Write a protein that binds this DNA or RNA. Structure first.
Lengths: 90, 44, 272
RNA sequence: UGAUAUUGAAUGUUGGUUUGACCUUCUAACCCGCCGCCCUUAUCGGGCGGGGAGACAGUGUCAGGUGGGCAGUUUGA
RNA sequence: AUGAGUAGCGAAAGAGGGGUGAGAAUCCCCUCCACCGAAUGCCUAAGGUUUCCUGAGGAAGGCUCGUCCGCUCAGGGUUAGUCGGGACCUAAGCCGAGGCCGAAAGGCGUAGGCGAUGGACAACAGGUUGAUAUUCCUGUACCACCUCCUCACCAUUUGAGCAAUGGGGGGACGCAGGAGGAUAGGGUAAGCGCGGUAUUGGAUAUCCGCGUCCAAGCAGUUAGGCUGGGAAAUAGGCAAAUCCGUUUCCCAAAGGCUGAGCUGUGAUGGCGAGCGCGAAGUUCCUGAUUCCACACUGCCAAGAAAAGCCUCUAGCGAGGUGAGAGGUGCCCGUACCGCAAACCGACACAGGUAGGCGAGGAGAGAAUCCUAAGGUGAUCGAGAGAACUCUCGUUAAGGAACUCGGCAAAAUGACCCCGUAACUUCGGGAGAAGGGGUGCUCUGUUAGGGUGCAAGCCCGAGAGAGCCGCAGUGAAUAGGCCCAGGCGACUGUUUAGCAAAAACACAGGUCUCUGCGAAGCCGUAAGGCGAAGUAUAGGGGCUGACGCCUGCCCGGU
RNA sequence: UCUACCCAUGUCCAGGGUGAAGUUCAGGUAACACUGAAUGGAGGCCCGAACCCACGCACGUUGAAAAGUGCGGGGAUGAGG
């Protein structure tokens, strides 16, 4: 297992902008992972400490394309709160 | 008026559900019938 | 003894109860309680097998020493108590070893009275003995058919059984049914008419009270339909309409002796 | 309800040819929703020990009776 | 296609001005008006499953239109050690190793385990965005666990300390009634603060409007509630015992368990009328359906289990105990609707949908009328005001002649006083019937009561005088009554969707069966209900309170 | 998942009235019995909202509705919902 496999990608919204102003970043993650895994993942990757983590998981939006009405994939997004006396990220 | 169908997913899944159908012989036979036809939703 | 309520209302009209004067307390021993759950006449199979049952006040079982296996241990009565599970009352007694038990409640018994259950014991009330050591001309209850099994007999309220004689290994006994029987002699029994003595002398007064006792209504067969009962049917209120009164299951009721003919206890019994 | 197999050991009894039948008795069969111990922290069962009943009962096969409890059917033109 | 541009367009107040836009009764904003207000309001389940928010669009759906949305497109949005649920407990029931039965299939069932609707369990009060929030932010806390560490104490084999999957305690319980205590809440009654003193005649104060708070936790305290204690000995508590239990002695109030709430802190903050800033922020009265609390009393129909917790030893026991500091604390759900246009009813359906909160005046009251907080103006309209239909309101004189029938409608209706029959099971009948009075002002803040230290607030019988009206429970709501009879004693139950009854049931009576492996019943049987009962019980049949009675036939079945 | 019955656990029933048993007091009795007040608080008790049920009518009867609505109605601390 690897942290690189844990994390999936970030979330770029005005919300995420507002939050990275306040030092707490966000991500989206494989659905099975947990809070401690992602915490250590960040610490191991970016070399940065953590104050806390707050985690979520959304369902799959139904959609429509012609007759076809499948469902979007699920998502497990995770907000992490860096400490002060901690680095930022690109 | 009150009507027949008062939904409770628990009751649905505990009567018409997969564990239940697999519990009994006759419930297995359903799944057999309910496959070789080709039903996508073979049970609750 | 009993109370006779005044007729403030047509339901309360005619009602009688017990005074519960013999009672001493209002709370049992947790150590001896045990749970129950009603059954509604249903069985393991879920099917209903007996009618007229279900839906009463809940209860909590009072464990009983119907055996009196303890011997050579003088006990002392402590209390008399109500048991919803039976017509009679019970008596909490305490032995010198610190053990506590419930027993049935004879009449004329009081708190502080002492008890012994072993064969050498005395034949006064409350004590228990084998029929051998018991003499002729005694009033007895919680009689047991087999040693060690406990009483499967006169236990109910106001009841009593008389002793008549012996044949060595067996013993003649009269029973509250009026019936004579041979009983194995080593089998124990307890002395004295059972206490309450007036349970039969009650006007329940209304229907709700029987419902509280857990009795469901009883539908007569002459109003059912013929699919349901033989007596059922008939335009207008009608008589039986056949050779005998009959059960829902097609058997007669009046006089038709139901006991098995090839039964074995016929040897031990005498009359009825 | 009876015959028979499980279902044997005796003491007598009466029959015709030893024999079977009948009454009593016993126990080891069988049975126990009786007790104690172990399996086992178990109200199942199952092994031991006792105890109780006992060649009965129960069960299987056969037979008779009863049997609208139940079923299939008829009840003319 | 016809029917036919016909019926219908699904309860309920809208009007106007502005704006948008190609285009407006129908969309947005404003102002008025109107409806709900024990509900059409706030929370929240089940269920739905993106309907939520924002911005575009108006082909379809919307019973019309549509610039609009619970429609279409894009995007975004749901943050938990403490909430609810799992890593905790068990009921009913279910599964069920082995096992017991059984043509097979399978059924039953022990040990064991699942299983909430219950038990136990650590966090609240303020802000916060367009959408989340006792989850985020700010403050202050708490629970469990861990030691790289600091401190204090104790002890290493009588060796301090730990706590059994065992024992014991406790958890652990009904129904009703009623006093008490406290609190939410309410009143604005004072007092305080802010603002205004107006144009219709009048009013500087004797006036108007608005607001007049703050937890969890920590320390202390308490209304009160329960509970008798201490010392020895032990036929029991499957092995043991300092714990239980039992007995005997010495004391008789103390002790303990609790305890709603209250005081200080928390609070050198927050909130707050009102204008990113910010005043006063107390007292009095009333007062629960809520808490103390099933606490007390009474009653009988006699009122879950288990685990958490405490304790006992057994056992483990060479390092432990306690406090502090530092640190760790997972998974699921969290949007939104939730008497509704998202749920169940095929519909944006006059229906149904568990539970918590639930204001004010009058008021006994959650009734009822009008209003708050707050929410709605309801998915076709305007315009004439006819027959006819429906729902309503009035009616001359008469007054049930209508009629199968006083069906329907009308009438009565609240409170107080007087008075109240035949009959009776002596309880009732009975709110019988029948009569009479209710408004406002002054005596009067009354006689008096509650509170209060008092002042001061609440309640307010009665009479006297007087004033008005057709009319004084002036509106809404809240019995029509009587005489007699049949049937059934009664309260109850029933043909969901034609029939509510004289039918069923009922308590009571009677007959019969059944000696406990009962009997009966289910099942092929095992296994079960009966019953963890035992003839004063259980089953079956008939009859039906109560009172007086229940006659003759046993030939037939 | 409707509905009948049952099991287990929970929960709801505004307000008002009647006034039992018992207890005490007084009269009364040899004692009682009995009588009058106070307390007390029962009841398949009363009136009546929520809630539940459906008798009477009307309307609807190609409905707002595949069993309803409106006006009244019955029960409403017990066989309760």
């Amino acid at each position: 297992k690897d942290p690189r496999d844990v994390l999936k990608r970030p979330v770029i919204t005005e919300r995420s902008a507002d939050l990275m102003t306040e030092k707490k970043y966000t991500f989206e993650v494989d659905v099975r992972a947990n809070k401690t895994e992602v915490k250590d993942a960040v610490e191991s990757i970016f070399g940065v400490k953590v104050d806390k983590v707050n985690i979520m998981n959304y369902k799959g939006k139904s959609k429509r394309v012609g007759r076809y009405t499948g469902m979007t994939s699920r998502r497990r997004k995770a907000i992490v709160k860096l400490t002060a006396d901690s680095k930022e990220i690109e | 008026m009150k009507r027949t169908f008062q939904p409770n997913n628990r009751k649905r899944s505990k009567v018409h559900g997969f564990r239940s159908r697999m519990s009994s012989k006759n419930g297995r036979l359903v799944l057999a019938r309910r496959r070789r036809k080709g039903r996508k939703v073979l049970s609750a | 003894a009993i109370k006779k309520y005044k007729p403030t209302s047509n339901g309360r009209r005619g009602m009688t109860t017990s005074d519960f004067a013999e009672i001493t307390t209002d709370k049992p021993e947790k150590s001896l309680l045990a749970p129950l759950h009603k059954k509604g006449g249903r069985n393991n199979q879920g099917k209903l097998t007996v009618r007229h049952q279900g839906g009463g006040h809940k209860r909590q079982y009072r464990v009983i020493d119907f055996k009196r296996d303890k011997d050579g241990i003088p006990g002392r009565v402590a209390t008399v108590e109500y048991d919803p599970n039976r017509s009679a009352n019970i008596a909490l007694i305490n032995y010198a070893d610190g053990e506590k038990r419930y027993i049935l409640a004879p009449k004329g018994i009081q708190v502080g009275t002492e008890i012994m259950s072993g064969p050498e014991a005395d034949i006064k009330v409350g004590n228990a003995l084998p029929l051998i050591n018991i003499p002729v001309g005694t009033v007895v209850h919680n009689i047991e058919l087999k040693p060690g099994k406990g009483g499967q007999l006169v236990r109910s309220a106001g009841t009593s059984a008389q002793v008549l004689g012996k044949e060595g290994k067996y013993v003649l006994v009269r029973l509250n049914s009026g019936e004579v029987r041979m009983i194995l002699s080593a089998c124990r029994a307890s002395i004295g008419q059972v206490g309450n003595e007036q349970h039969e002398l009650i006007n329940i007064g209304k229907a709700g009270r029987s419902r509280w006792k857990g009795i469901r209504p009883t539908v007569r067969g002459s109003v059912m339909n013929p699919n349901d009962h033989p007596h059922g049917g008939g335009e207008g209120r009608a008589p039986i309409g056949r050779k005998s009164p009959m059960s829902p299951w097609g058997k007669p009721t009046l006089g038709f002796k139901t006991r098995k003919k090839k039964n074995k206890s016929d040897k031990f019994i005498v009359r009825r």
